[PDB]
Amino acid sequence: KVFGRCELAAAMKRHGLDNYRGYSLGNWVCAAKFESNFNTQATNRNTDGSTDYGILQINSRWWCNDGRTPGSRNLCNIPCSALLSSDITASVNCAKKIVSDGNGMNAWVAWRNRCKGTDVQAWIRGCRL
Ligand code: NA
């Protein structure tokens, strides 16, 4: 599923991401735009051979199991395929564990490089939330 911007903002808010660990909703929408272009089915191979899955490009090195990432963990206890569903529950639940790991949203390099310190409220502008 390719989410609309406000559609994804509504879904993230309903799932309790708005101001989760102090990160306003626009931070999460911005991260999703540059990780996935709001596409739940997005997959990208990392140089280390792990893969990033779904709207928030969650990494098989630590967070989900894809059966092909040697020496990796599955700290969200989910098959990586669950991160590609039209229903973002698994992605959101897993993102809550990631952002709680100590480095906040710096875990998402695209957030650090493209969203951090920017006018992230623009990402929820015009949305009925
Ligand atoms: Na894994």
Task: Please list, in sequence order, all residues whose beta carbon lies within 8 angstroms of the beta carbon of residue 103, skipping any fewer than 6 positions away.
Answer: none
Give the integer Cα–Cα distance in Å for 69 and 64. 10
Q: In what order do the strands lie in the sheet with 58-59?
A: 43-45, 51-53, 58-59
Q: By residue range, what is the domain housing residue 52?
A: 5-124
Say which amino acid occupies 45: R
Angle, helix 5-14 to helix 25-36, in steps of 10 degrees = 130
Report CA(1)–ligand 1 centroid distance (Å).
24
Cα angle, residue 92 at apex, residues 98 and 53 outer, rounded to 5°: 75
CATH number at residue 18: 1.10.530.10
- Known binding residue 101? Answer is yes
Tokens representing 101? 């790991």
Cβ atoms 96, 28 nearer than 8 A: no
Cβ atoms 123, 9 nearer than 8 A: yes
Locate breaks in the chain with C to N over 2.5 A; list the residue preceding each: none
> In total, how many domains does the chain have?
1
Report CA(84)–ligand 1 centroid distance (Å).
15
Report resolution (Å) to 1 decimal. Answer: 1.6
